[PDB]
């Protein structure tokens, strides 16, 4: 996890999702004032916070481990005239400096896997105040079973990958309120996901087209699309939004 990430610095998402599914996931949520205290965990270059700047009040905190995303997260904030309630700064999923109930609301999209969907449920919790909201999107499954290949690519990829029952039956253990959940739109994987990926695929293959190792992980995001082309049946990215009890 080298190189990769000079390659997803220039995508405007690092991972599934669309302004159609932040807005549906912030419509059940309740609704914030410009006092309210957000965090975006996991933001990447803020591709998603900004949709999120736009639906919600409050100041929103986006953090991610690496520090050339959040360079061009703060880039963008002052080009669009919201650096004030919108700041990134560079740190850990397992160890996020929010002192406890500080946060109304909590926010991660294709991120929550990095520390495990029922882990994150429960540890970041503590930073949220009575009543406030998580939602997180996350790779699930859609139905008991499903054909060999795919099963094998998660089961490596993502272990923790589980059926939408499961996941729902861990926000109530954590102490959470299912709210809702939704299938993320396939619009959210092949447009805005994967379509941008070919905009930087030849400057790209050019740079290292003689490296072994960036050529397999070229490979990997090719083969991505075909999984996701193959079996967009069985799995994909779920929104879960829940309320502190
Ligand atoms: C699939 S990307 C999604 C980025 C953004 N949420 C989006 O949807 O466009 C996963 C993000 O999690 C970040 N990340 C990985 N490990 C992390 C950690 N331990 N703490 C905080 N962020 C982490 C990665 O750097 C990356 O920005």
Same mark, same amino acid.
């Given at each position: 996890?080298?190189?990769?990430?000079?390659?997803?610095?220039?995508?405007?998402?690092?991972?599934?999702?669309?302004?159609?599914?932040?807005?549906?996931?912030?419509?059940?949520? /309740? &609704?914030?004032?410009?006092? %309210?205290?957000? @965090? *975006?965990?996991?933001? =990447?270059?803020? #591709?998603?916070?900004?949709? +999120?700047?736009?639906?919600?009040?409050?100041?929103?905190?986006?953090?991610?481990?690496?520090?050339?995303?959040?360079?061009?997260? /703060? &880039?963008?904030?002052?080009? %669009?005239?919201? @650096? *004030?309630?919108?700041? =990134?700064?560079? #740190?850990?999923?397992?160890? +996020?400096?929010?002192?406890?109930?500080?946060?109304?609301?909590?926010?991660?999209?294709?991120?929550?896997?990095?520390?495990?969907?029922?882990?994150?449920?429960?540890?970041?919790?503590?930073?949220?105040?009575?009543? =406030?909201?998580?939602?997180?999107?996350?790779?699930?499954?859609?139905?008991?079973?499903?054909?060999?290949?795919?099963?094998?690519?998660?089961?490596?990829?993502?272990?923790?990958?589980?059926?939408?029952?499961?996941?729902?039956?861990?926000?109530?253990?954590?102490?959470?309120?299912?709210?809702?959940?939704?299938?993320?739109?396939?619009?959210?994987?092949?447009?805005?996901?994967?379509?941008?990926?070919?905009?930087?695929?030849?400057?790209?293959?050019?740079?290292?087209?003689?490296?072994?190792?960036?050529?397999?992980?070229?490979?990997?995001?090719?083969?991505?699309?075909?999984?996701?082309?193959?079996?967009?049946?069985?799995?994909?990215?779920?929104?879960?939004?829940?309320?502190?009890?």
């Amino acid at each position: 996890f080298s190189f990769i990430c000079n390659y997803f610095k220039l995508l405007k998402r690092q991972g599934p999702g669309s302004p159609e599914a932040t807005r549906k996931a912030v419509s059940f949520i /309740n &609704e914030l004032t410009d006092d %309210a205290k957000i @965090a *975006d965990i996991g933001c =990447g270059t803020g #591709g998603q916070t900004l949709f +999120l700047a736009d639906y919600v009040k409050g100041q929103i905190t986006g953090i991610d481990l690496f520090p050339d995303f959040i360079e061009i997260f /703060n &880039e963008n904030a002052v080009k %669009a005239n919201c @650096a *004030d309630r919108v700041k =990134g700064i560079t #740190g850990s999923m397992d160890n +996020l400096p929010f002192q406890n109930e500080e946060l109304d609301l909590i926010w991660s999209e294709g991120a929550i896997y990095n520390i495990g969907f029922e882990r994150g449920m429960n540890e970041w919790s503590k930073y949220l105040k009575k009543g =406030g909201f998580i939602a997180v999107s996350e790779a699930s499954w859609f139905t008991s079973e499903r054909p060999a290949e795919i099963e094998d690519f998660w089961m490596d990829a993502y272990p923790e990958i589980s059926v939408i029952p499961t996941c729902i039956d861990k926000m109530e253990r954590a102490g959470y309120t299912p709210t809702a959940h939704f299938i993320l739109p396939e619009n959210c994987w092949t447009e805005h996901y994967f379509a941008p990926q070919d905009e930087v695929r030849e400057t790209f293959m050019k740079e290292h087209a003689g490296n072994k190792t960036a050529m397999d992980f070229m490979k990997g995001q090719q083969y991505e699309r075909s999984l996701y082309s193959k079996y967009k049946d069985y799995y994909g990215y779920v929104f879960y939004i829940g309320q502190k009890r």
